[PDB]
RNA sequence: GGGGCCUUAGCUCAGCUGGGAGAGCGCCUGCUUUGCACGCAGGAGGUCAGCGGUUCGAUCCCGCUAGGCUCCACCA
RNA sequence: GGGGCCUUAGCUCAGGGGAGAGCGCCUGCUCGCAGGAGGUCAGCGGUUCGAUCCCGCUAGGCUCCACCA
RNA sequence: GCACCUCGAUGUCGGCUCAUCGCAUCCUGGGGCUGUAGUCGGUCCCAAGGGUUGGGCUGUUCGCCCAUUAAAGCGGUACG
RNA sequence: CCGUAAACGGUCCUAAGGUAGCGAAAUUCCUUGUCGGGUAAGUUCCGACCCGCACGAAAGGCGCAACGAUCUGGGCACUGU
């Protein structure tokens, strides 16, 4: 369960989804990760269910690095009204991710120990997803 | 007892000790005891108008009835109509045991309009009932009847007050001889109780008194006798004392010369009602107000002697098993034939130099080696059995420790301390759900002597209140209170009355020479994860005591 | 048909998430009470709806059968 | 669900510069006194030098509506 | 929810009468897996051919109960 | 509002806070309240419990013989309803 416990605005624009990820593209903290494909909101909900879904078949192993973070709120109108007199109450938080972007990371286990986790994870995400390491050119 | 003859002597007392007076406080702290604080002339009294079912008293207390809860609403009756009143006159109602108070209260609009306050003793039938003594309708009773249960002498707010049954008997006092011998009518020798059922307000103890002091019973040797008690008690002669036999306890404001035994003679008839009551009053309150309590602590103890029996017959069990699992190795060694429906085959002798009596084993129509393995499996199940009833065993005995160190602790505690041993089991989830006030003392030399009564208080007493080299006193191998003396070097004296102090306040308060040990508190610990309220210690001393509850009584500091 | 909660002493009901079954009313025994049906302790009653799986012990966990309440939408 | 009024001692209620009564508990004083235990002022966060006092919200308690097919 | 069609009229609930259509199938027919020993079952397939009740309460649909049945199935057709 | 077993006590407020008698009503949202009767089955009816959103004493209260092209339940006879 992860939100800001202050924020500037209790409601904001939901904005746009246009174009690649601006920022966490590479993988530099683990060594495997999840590289993000098409774009949509992720609910800190997902978030959870993709953390203990690693952290548990993890049982032994390393930390887990949350690259996402839901700082973006979105408002939800109450049901069975009329459109409009005035924006509804905030409801949930969601975390605007682009494709290209890392989402988790790990390192300290194996490759098939990884594999399976970051599949466990990315079977509970709303996007699609692929397996991607920390390539040493250098 | 408190007869209509006490209540003669009470009556006299209570006129020779508070006249007029002001009552400034009213205070209701148990359900059947009032204390009315009287400013009479001199100093400040307390009054003690008491409706027990069993413990019924009038007396002027001394001690600090403490406690003072949330106030019921007799009390508050009592507070609004009585209160800044006077007293006019305490008499009783001829020889009965009926108390009658006339309250020259003024009324809360300003005029004044007196009252009168109706206290009857009678056992399991006493009441407080307030009127307005102008139409004697009672304004409230202490104990509410209805039309149906106890039909006469209903006792309702604004119903007409009504007196107690006459009791058809003559007034024995001023009576003369002649009256008093010409009714009884003596003819095979049920004497005490034709005294009781034909004299006016008369115990059974008086009468008893009354056959001995006449001698051997006769026509005239019996009546004499009686008319000479009569006599003294008229002309306010008491001689109020207390005399026991074996442990239970009589009182009266005569010397007593049948049942011969330690007669402890009192100055008045309020130090006398003081330290009568001093221990069973306090008994009857914390059991009227703690009895569920004590009853799950009970049950619970007897579903764990009930647990370990049933533990001890799987001990028992455990040995039964193993011979399941010799004949299971039996039946493997020679299960190759007679393997359809399988029982009764004779097994010959695997081990030993014994050659005993070929077996015939008995097995279920599953299959000829799973019957073997059952009793196998059974064998291995026995054996993690033998480690987990033992832990089980070694945890029922520490929580009927606990719990009859918790026994000791709710029997000798007083209302505040059973409370707080409620707090305290919930705190245990045993019951589904700051710095406190304890119990202090004064030595003989000034030196101060602080008993815990609660485990809660004891822990935080051991290791918050109490310096070192403070010597704190235990019971040897029984369950007590925990006595400490906040004084650098600790008198002989001091040391013997503390020790009499955590006698009384034990599981042996009852009992003579009760083992008592003393030792520095820098000596005792408590292990981490155990059960709290358990504290150890070592190189202790020991001395003898006896747990009188006068010492008690006399080191209050308060 | 879909979800949920229970079947516990003659009656009304607790029992904490497996550590060994109880409160009140009700029926008896004994004590006590001068007197107005005002008090105390001690006994029973339960296969915890019925059966069989788990583990060292099951109202509690599990499966399979009898039962009772809730919970579900109109409308003009 | 939508407006309006409150959440203050154990109970009932008054009240920008640092907050109180009656009842309930005590304290010595012979129908009234002079004093003490108990207050996250329901909670969060902004404006300044400080908030019971001003504000945006969460739970709670009252009052008025939730009508036309 | 919106207000696109009708305010120089598109009669709106529940029942009666007459039906028709789609299976996301209540029974009957054919199967797979079962912790399916047999009867009775559970789940998932293929299948609309036919049939899917008489009452007490309430205007009621719905719902509860009584007695059956092989079952007393969900919906659409201007909530036919 | 808060306690205490209608009734009494503490506090705010007003002019004072519902007496007798009725009560799930031509009045009750929850609600087909609970129990019993009537029927095999009764959201209607009848008799009690008060838990009266939101009965109540001449905008009268509670009963009441006879009476009604009145309303709501239940029986006998009777029949194509």
């Known amino acids: 369960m992860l939100l800001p416990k202050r924020v500037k605005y209790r409601r904001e624009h939901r904005g746009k989804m246009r174009g ?9 903290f ?23 879904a690693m952290t548990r078949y993890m049982k032994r192993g390393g930390k887990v690095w949350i690259k996402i973070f839901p700082s973006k709120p979105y408002t939800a109108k109450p049901l069975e009204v009329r459109m409009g007199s005035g924006k509804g109450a905030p409801e949930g938080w969601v975390a605007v991710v682009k494709p290209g972007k890392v989402l988790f990371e790990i390192s300290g286990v194996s490759e098939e120990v990884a594999r399976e986790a970051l599949r466990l994870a990315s079977h509970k995400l709303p996007i699609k997803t692929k397996f991607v390491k920390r390539e040493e050119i250098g | 007892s408190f007869d209509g003859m006490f209540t003669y002597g009470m009556t006299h007392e209570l006129n020779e000790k508070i006249m007029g007076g002001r009552i400034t406080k009213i205070h209701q702290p148990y359900k059947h005891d009032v204390i009315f604080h009287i400013r009479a002339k001199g100093k400040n009294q307390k009054l003690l108008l008491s409706a027990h079912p069993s413990y019924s008293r009038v007396h002027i207390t001394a001690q600090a009835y403490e406690n003072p809860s949330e106030p019921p609403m007799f009390c508050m009756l009592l507070r609004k109509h009585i209160e800044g009143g006077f007293i006019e006159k305490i008499e009783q109602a001829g020889l009965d045991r009926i108390m009658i108070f006339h309250i020259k209260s003024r009324n809360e609009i300003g005029d004044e309009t007196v009252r009168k306050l109706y206290v009857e003793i009678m056992g399991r039938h006493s009441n407080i009932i307030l009127t307005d003594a102008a139409e004697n309708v009672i304004i409230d009773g202490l104990k509410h009847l209805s039309p149906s249960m106890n039909s006469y002498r209903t006792v309702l707010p ?13 007034s024995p006092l001023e009576a003369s001889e002649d009256d008093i011998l010409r009714h009884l009518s003596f003819q095979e020798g049920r004497l005490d109780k034709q005294i009781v059922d034909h004299f006016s ?10 056959v001995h002091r006449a001698g051997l019973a006769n026509k005239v040797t019996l009546p004499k006798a009686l008319l000479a008690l ?28 049948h049942l011969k035994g330690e007669a402890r003679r009192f100055d008045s008839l309020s130090e006398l009602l003081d330290r009568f009551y001093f221990g069973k009053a306090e008994r009857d309150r914390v059991k009227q107000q703690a009895q569920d309590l004590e009853r799950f602590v009970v049950n619970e103890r007897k579903k764990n002697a009930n647990k370990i029996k049933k533990l001890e017959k799987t001990l028992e069990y455990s040995e039964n098993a193993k011979e399941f699992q010799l004949y299971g190795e039996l039946l493997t060694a020679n299960l190759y034939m007679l393997k359809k429906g399988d029982k009764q085959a004779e097994v010959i002798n695997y081990y030993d130099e014994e050659s005993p009596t070929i077996t015939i084993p008995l097995n279920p129509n599953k299959t000829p080696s799973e019957n073997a393995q059952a009793y196998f499996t059974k064998y291995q199940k026995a054996k993690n059995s033998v480690a987990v009833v033992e832990e089980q065993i070694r945890l029922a005995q520490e929580e009927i420790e606990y719990f009859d160190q918790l026994i000791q602790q709710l029997s000798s505690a007083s209302p505040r301390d059973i409370s707080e041993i409620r707090e305290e089991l ?3 989830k045993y019951l589904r759900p700051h710095n406190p006030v304890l119990e202090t003392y004064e030595s003989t030399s000034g030196l101060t002597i602080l008993v815990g009564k609660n485990n809660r208080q004891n822990e935080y007493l051991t290791t918050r209140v109490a310096a070192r080299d403070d010597i ?29 102090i955590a006698a009384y306040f034990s599981k042996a308060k009852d009992s003579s020479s009760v083992p008592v ?20 210690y070592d190189s202790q001393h020991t001395v003898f005591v006896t747990p009188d509850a006068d010492t008690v009584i006399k080191l209050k500091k308060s």
């Not at chain 1, 098409?38 to 978030?47: C, D, V």
């Open chain 2, 158 to 170: 604004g119903q007409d007050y009504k007196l107690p049954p006459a009791q058809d008997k003559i």
């Open chain 1, 20 to 28: 690649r990820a601006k920022g966490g593209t590479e993988v530099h």
């Open chain 2, 517 to 536: 040990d003393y030792t520095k508190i820098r000596h005792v610990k408590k292990p981490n994860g155990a059960k709290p309220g358990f504290v150890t």
């Open chain 2, 230 to 257: 009569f006599a003294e008690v008229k002309e306010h002669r008491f001689i109020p004392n207390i005399t026991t036999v074996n442990g239970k306890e009589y009182f009266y404001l005569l010397e007593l010369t």
């Open chain 2, 426 to 428: 919930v705190e245990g």
């Open chain 1, 30 to 52: 683990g060594e495997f990760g999840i590289q993000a494909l098409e774009a949509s909101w992720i609910t800190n909900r997902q978030i959870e269910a993709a953390r203990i």
């Open chain 2, 472 to 500: 704190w006193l235990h019971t040897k191998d029984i369950p007590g209170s925990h006595v400490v003396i906040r004084s650098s070097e600790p008198d002989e004296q001091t040391i013997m009355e503390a020790a009499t």
């Open chain 2, 201 to 210: 307000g008369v115990s059974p103890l008086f009468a008893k008194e009354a």
